[PDB]
Structure 1
Amino acid sequence: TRTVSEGVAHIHASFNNTIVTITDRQGNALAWATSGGQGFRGSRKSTPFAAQVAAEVAGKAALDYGLKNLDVLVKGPGPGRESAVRALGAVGYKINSITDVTPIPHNGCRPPKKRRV
């Protein structure tokens, strides 16, 4: 029902999974997909292919709202961060800009202990 011309894309890339959520400006959600949810439920969730599939499905779902130009914000490490923008370009969104938003604490909270494996 709602029609919006411009929007934002958020890529939460981690070492185990990648979430792609396409929202409008002001952060109201419009669509969301996950590498694990889009099949590939295993150690392959972190592989670039699953991120590409998630981005493709999210873009196809979000096309219903008539979004042609997108801004990309990418958070955190993890394979598949690059694949999301490639999939968005393939599905046809015109990427105005791509930016990184990974948080950096200024020596705040103590991290967990080192694994002995």
Structure 2
Amino acid sequence: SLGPQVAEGENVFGVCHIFASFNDTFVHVTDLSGKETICRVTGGMKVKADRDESSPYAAMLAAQDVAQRCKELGITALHIKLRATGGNRTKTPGPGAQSALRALARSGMKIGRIEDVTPIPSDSTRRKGGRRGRRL
């Protein structure tokens, strides 16, 4: 975890893959390639209370603690690939998503170019429910 680059003239980039689901939050640091990882760490290690791991309070706290540890490793710049569950399923990030986001706003990492990358299908397989739907 040592970028030999000089600090400001140019950045040694990593790339954080921020998964924000409605029941989990991943954080997966990698190289420019992506194939090689530096540090991945999740919330579920840091907080053990099933009901409020995806809670926005939990996802924020998680994002701060995780981003803190990656900064700790000393990577100055990051590419970003925020991602949600996707597919035939939901296209909206869950309640953790946004608390994590604001948390990473205060956390301090130098940010390269951002992009969205949730895998939307052209034409999809059937959603997990009835025809009559998740009813309640």
2:2 partner letter: T
2:25 partner letter: T
TM-score normalized by the length of structure 1:
0.80
2:22 partner letter: F
Structure 1, unpaired ranges of 5+ = none
SS in 1 for 2:49: coil
Deviations 1:29-54 (A, max 9, x none): 11222222211522111112222222
Distance in 2 of aligned mates of 1:40 and 1:97: 34
Distance in 2 of aligned mates of 1:35 and 1:64: 17
C-alpha change, 1:64 and 1:35, in structure 2 (3 Å) is closer
SS in 2 for 1:53: helix
Distance in 2 of aligned mates of 1:26 and 1:71: 11
List aligned pairs for 1:31-46, cutoff 5 A: 31-46=39-54
Q: Which has the higher strand share?
A: 1
SS in 1 for 2:95: coil
- Aligned residue pairs total 116
C-alpha change, 1:30 and 1:57, in structure 2 (3 Å) is farther
RMSD: 2.1
Structure 2, unpaired ranges of 5+ = 4-11, 85-92
Distance in 2 of aligned mates of 1:23 and 1:9: 6
Q: Which residue of 2 aligns with 1:107?
A: 123
Q: Which shows bigger deviation, 11-20 or 53-62?
A: 53-62
Deviations 1:62-104 (A, max 9, x none): 2344311112111112123233343334332122233221111
Distance in 2 of aligned mates of 1:59 and 1:66: 11
Q: Which has the larger radius of gyration?
A: 2
SS in 2 for 1:111: coil
